[PDB]
């Protein structure tokens, strides 16, 4: 009966996992078994996507979110993002699923049969949450692991095939990266950018050199920080600033994950470089800009002088100026003029869209992409009726960008709530009033009246 | 010991499900409103009254099924199964809308039954009947919305139909034809419903977060004994918290819980009154002064005028199908539409 | 002590009539700036070109509004999501024309309200309280973020954020319904369960405590005078209330743990409002309500309308009329 009931652990069944806080071995099991579930799902889901995959259809008509991640790393894809070999997707799938079993095994071993507590078995693996030194040591090791992983992406990009590059000449292709960006003026310039319109903070990164270079910096930073924390213990100002307990550490990480969930949400919503529209569909802005182009192309073909066509409001029907002067598409899409994408930039000159290029250089492949993207705008119903809310049933489509943004906002939000929950609880537990106010010593009774 | 007293003894026996005299009204009428709704959403159409499918049997789902109101041409007929419309023909009663009045009238009497039950059980046990009194607000909503509102209109056709998406249509009808959001009675009702949710949440959170420590467990639920004499949380600490956070705070436990009855109960009453006005098309639709300026000053625009353009689109785009008995034929060229859309 | 530590004890003092705190050091300035700008704007701001089409909407009382029609109008669609401080304008007149006050108000306000949540945590820790009132405020706070920040992010413009005005709020609701069928969205249906249920349980708990007040007063005095602030004993018979309410339903549908009962009161509306907040936040990314338009068809394939189709007819009336001069192309994609 070692914890495992409310009487001995002080925790009810619906808070049962809180019975593990000081059972490092069973806790190790719960974590490794859970890692198995993560890795299992990456396996099972990829295989499911492959079984359902039709290469003639665009990935974004098929409800795929993991295959697009693999293709982005340059496996299985060629010019234009066309699928040329599915074997690699099968491989990623199978290897995670096999791996999930060994994780499973070790999780259930440690949860059920292994030592409930690791500290009498072994001083390297056991730990006290209040050991500030052991905690930064473990922190230090996982820092190192993460640094290594950022560099595996670099490896992939420079030494093992390159990456899919939606911006590559001739409509996009897998491309080896040879001159990553190491200038910290660019790399950390991204971090100091405003997160607002036309800047977009780190979500604005629009080339693979910047992507690969930033991951060189992060790799080394994480490796360096890991060493730092393995070799140091925390300073006095940090000791006095923080709560040092299991739940507190949990709540710090929940804060972090919540922050990261919201950033990813915005990444997949706006960014068409590491979430290539060939694979994930047009962005909301992209689709809206693509519609103005489509009817620009249509009407200009009929004889419309689109540069001089005054619309109903006095603004130009097809083209207007942004508030700083750039020539942009007119209509409601005026809000999306910050958009950039490989199908549109050829029409761009120094004052924004070039009217001579519009009149003379639109290629059929741009007309195709613009019509493709307008009709795959990321709008749709929860039962995957594609379109605006008033559209009739027919098209079975919701953009993977919608699915990925919405799911990760929901998770980021709840993880923020988790943070406040455990942060507040870890504060009150450490001062010792998480179970209630002591009747014999009610603080407020000792305080002067307010009035 | 007469037969009346022996029947009273048995009706008020302590049993898993108390009956009472109120039960003779409540259980038959509740069960029949329930049973009738379930039957009608499972098996019955709205094809002859509305031009609509409305049952699972026709392939509606839980959101789109309804027991729909009767045809406009029935007026306010009671639509008795033995009455002159259906002539005792069960099948044709279902097809003319009989289940709507069946549910609406049994439900009204079941609600009477439930309130009588509140009075009945309250009297037997020895408590003041404020729960009954509070239940007056649901009754006022139900009576003003489902009975009075259609009685002032042409027919039961314009009452709410009993279904999820049917009620949403109600909602939107009220926006486009009545401008119900602009009605100060509905605003007051909104304030009492949101305010009541506010109170609900803030009272429960306050009490959960000023518990005294009355047990050693991390689960704080076991440290409450219902017979205990002592407050289970600190009013004094709660009052200081809110006084310093919010500037004022309750100091009186009784006032607080009376306030909790008062807010949501009063809100529903206020909205009831507004709906009675809407029975008569006695709307708060317009602001004359805004219309006089707008009509003379084409550059005067406000959110009030924008919303009325929306109302006008709702009316024209939804009337022909929503009110089929009118045979509205609107050629495309008369449909109000902005640019492009 | 030293000057810094004198200031620190004052900021965090439990003796101040309104608690300051470190969150308060941010909350007070930002709320004051937001409040002052809002009041001046509501009374006196000239018209704002909300939709970027040089068609100014008049929001202020002095330019012909009353309390119901008036509003601080969202910033221009031309600006989109760009940050538009006063000092980016060439003049206040430009800033007023393009809706600058909206940005200033909402950003100072969202920041002030987030610190209000943290300040609830902070004072709970100085008082020795359990910490989770702020978790309950997180439900309304999150709902404010949804209509002022998240929904404009997903749609690309603060011009589609909620106006700061009674009728502007209704404008926002109607157009949201056109563009997302929020009524058909289960997270919003959960919001209604949350708030209807919240009011229901609010009336319930009040009526039941009020019904079971112990006689402590005569018929001429308010019964409220039978409770004395700080009294150790309870002023109602929860056992009596369980006996009423258990019999009204059945015995096991009724709480007799006060702690369980008050936690239910907390949880129900907070969860429900979380869901509706999330509902607005995911429709921000155009994952909309169920669409059952033309879902029932007969053996030949005639469309057999349901009530969803009737809703769609009203949605289309909202769609084709909202922002009537603003679309030049046939799909309203954001």
């Amino acid at each position: 009966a070692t914890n495992r009931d409310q009487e001995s652990s002080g925790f009810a069944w619906w808070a049962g996992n809180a019975r593990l806080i000081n059972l490092s071995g069973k806790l190790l099991g719960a974590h490794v078994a859970h890692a198995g579930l993560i890795v299992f799902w990456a396996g099972a889901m990829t295989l499911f996507e492959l079984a359902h995959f039709i290469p003639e259809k665009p990935m974004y008509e098929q409800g795929l979110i993991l295959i697009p991640h693999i293709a982005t790393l340059g496996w299985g894809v060629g010019p234009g993002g066309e699928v040329v070999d599915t074997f690699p997707f099968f491989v990623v799938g199978v290897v995670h699923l096999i791996s999930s079993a060994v994780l499973g095994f070790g999780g259930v071993y440690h949860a059920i049969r292994g030592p409930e507590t690791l500290e009498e078995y072994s001083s390297f693996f056991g730990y006290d949450w209040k050991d500030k030194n052991k905690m930064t040591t473990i922190l230090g090791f996982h820092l190192i692991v993460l640094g290594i992983g950022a560099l595996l992406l670099v490896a992939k990009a420079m030494f093992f095939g390159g990456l899919y590059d939606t911006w590559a000449p001739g409509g996009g292709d897998v491309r080896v990266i040879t001159n990553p960006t190491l200038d910290p003026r660019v790399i950390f310039g991204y971090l100091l950018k405003s997160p607002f319109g036309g800047e977009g903070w780190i979500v604005s990164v629009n080339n693979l050199e910047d992507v690969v270079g930033g991951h060189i910096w992060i790799g080394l930073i994480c490796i360096a920080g890991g060493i730092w924390h393995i070799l140091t213990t925390p300073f006095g100002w940090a000791r006095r600033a923080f709560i040092w307990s299991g739940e507190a550490y949990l709540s710090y990480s929940l804060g972090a994950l919540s922050m990261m969930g919201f950033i990813a949400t915005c990444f997949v919503w706006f960014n068409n470089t590491v979430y290539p529209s060939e694979f994930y569909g047009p962005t909301g802005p992209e689709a809206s800009q693509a519609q103005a182009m489509t009817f620009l192309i249509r009407d200009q073909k009929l004889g419309a002088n689109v540069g001089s066509a005054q619309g109903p409001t006095g603004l130009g029907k097809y083209l207007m100026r942004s508030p700083t002067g750039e020539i942009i598409f007119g209509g409601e899409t005026m809000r999306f003029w910050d958009f950039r994408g490989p199908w549109l930039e050829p029409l761009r000159g120094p004052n924004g869209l070039d009217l001579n290029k519009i009149k003379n250089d639109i290629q059929p492949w741009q007309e195709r992409r613009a019509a493709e993207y307008m009709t795959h705008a990321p709008l749709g119903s929860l039962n995957s009726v594609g379109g605006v809310a008033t559209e009739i049933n027919s098209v079975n489509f919701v953009s993977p960008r919608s699915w990925l943004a919405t799911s990760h906002f929901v998770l980021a939000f709840f993880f923020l709530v988790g943070h406040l929950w455990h942060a507040g609880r870890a504060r009150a537990a450490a001062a010792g009033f998480e179970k209630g106010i002591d009747r014999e010593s009610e603080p407020v009774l000792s305080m002067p009246s307010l009035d | 010991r007469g037969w009346f007293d022996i029947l009273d003894d048995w009706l008020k026996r302590d049993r898993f499900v108390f009956v009472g005299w109120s039960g003779i009204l409540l259980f038959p009428c509740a069960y029949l409103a329930l049973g009738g709704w379930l039957t009608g959403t499972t098996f019955v159409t709205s094809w002859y009254t509305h031009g609509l499918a409305s049952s699972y049997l026709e392939g509606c789902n839980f959101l789109t099924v309804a027991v729909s109101t009767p045809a406009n041409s029935m007026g306010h007929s009671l639509l008795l199964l033995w009455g002159p419309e259906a002539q005792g023909d069960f099948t044709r009663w279902c097809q003319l809308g009989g289940l709507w009045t069946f549910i609406a009238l049994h439900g009204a009497f079941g609600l009477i039954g439930f309130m009588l039950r509140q009075f009945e059980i309250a009297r037997l046990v020895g408590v003041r009947p404020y729960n009954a009194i509070a239940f007056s607000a649901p009754i006022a909503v139900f009576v003003s919305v489902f009975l009075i509102y259609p009685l002032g209109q042409s027919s039961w056709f314009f009452a709410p139909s009993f279904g999820v998406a049917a009620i949403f249509r109600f909602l939107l009808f009220f926006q486009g034809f009545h401008n119900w959001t602009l009605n100060p009675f509905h605003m007051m009702g909104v304030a009492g419903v949101l305010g009541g949710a506010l109170l609900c949440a803030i009272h429960g959170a306050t009490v959960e977060n000023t518990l005294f420590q009355d047990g050693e467990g991390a689960s704080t639920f076991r440290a409450f004994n219902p017979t205990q004499a002592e407050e289970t949380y600190s009013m004094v600490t709660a009052n200081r918290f809110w006084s310093q956070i919010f500037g004022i705070a309750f100091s009186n436990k009784r006032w607080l819980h009376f306030f909790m009855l008062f807010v949501p109960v009063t809100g529903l009453w206020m909205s009831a009154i507004g709906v009675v006005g809407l029975a008569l098309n006695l709307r708060s639709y317009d602001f004359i002064s805004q219309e006089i300026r707008a009509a003379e000053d084409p550059e005067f625009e406000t959110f009030y005028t924008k919303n009325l353009l929306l109302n006008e689109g709702i009316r024209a785009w939804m009337a022909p199908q929503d009110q089929p008995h009118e045979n509205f034929v609107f050629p495309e060229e008369v449909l109000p539409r902005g640019n492009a859309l | 002590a030293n000057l810094w530590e004198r200031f620190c004890n004052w900021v965090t003092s439990t003796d101040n009539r309104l608690y300051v705190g470190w969150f308060g050091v941010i909350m007070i300035p930002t709320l004051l700036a937001a409040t002052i700008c809002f009041v001046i704007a509501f009374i006196a701001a000239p018209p704002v070109d909300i939709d970027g089409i040089r068609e100014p909407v008049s929001g202020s009382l002095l330019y012909g509004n009353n309390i119901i029609t008036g509003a601080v109008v969202p910033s221009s669609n031309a600006i989109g999501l760009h940050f538009y401080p006063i000092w980016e304008a060439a003049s206040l007149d430009e800033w007023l024309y393009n809706g600058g006050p909206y940005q200033l108000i909402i950003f100072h306000f969202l920041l002030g309200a987030s610190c209000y949540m943290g300040r609830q945590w902070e004072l709970s820790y100085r008082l020795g309280m359990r910490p989770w009132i702020c978790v309950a405020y997180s439900a309304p706070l999150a709902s404010a973020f949804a209509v002022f920040l998240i929904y404009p992010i997903g749609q690309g413009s603060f011009s589609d954020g909620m106006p700061l005005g009674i009728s502007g709020t209704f404008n926002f609701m109607i157009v949201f319904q056109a563009e997302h069928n929020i009524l058909m969205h289960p997270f919003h249906q959960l919001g209604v369960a949350g708030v209807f249920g919240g009011a229901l349980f609010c009336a319930m708990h009040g009526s039941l405590v009020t019904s079971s007040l112990i006689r402590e007063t005569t018929e001429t005095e308010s019964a409220n005078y039978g409770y004395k602030f700080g009294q150790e004993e309870e002023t109602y018979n929860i056992v009596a209330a369980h006996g009423y309410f258990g019999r009204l339903i059945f015995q096991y549908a009724s709480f007799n743990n006060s702690r369980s009962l008050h936690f239910f009161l907390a949880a129900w509306p907070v969860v429900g409002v979380w869901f509706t907040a999330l509902g607005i936040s995911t429709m921000a990314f155009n994952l909309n309500g169920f669409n059952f338009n033309h879902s029932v068809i007969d053996a030949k394939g005639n469309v057999i309308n349901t009530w969803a189709d009737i809703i769609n007819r009203a949605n289309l009336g909202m769609e084709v009329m909202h922002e009537r001069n603003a679309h030049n192309f046939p799909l309203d994609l954001a």
Binding site: S449 | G247, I248, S251 | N66, F229
Partner: peptide
């Protein structure tokens, strides 16, 4: 006249807040 009325009534409410906080009946522990 109507603008003055609205602002007047708004202004009376803000003053009421001030009195209601700073000149409440102090809650006393009796």
């Amino acid at each position: 006249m109507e603008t003055i009325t609205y602002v007047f009534i708004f202004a009376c409410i803000i003053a009421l807040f001030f009195f209601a906080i700073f000149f409440r009946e102090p809650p006393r522990i009796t």
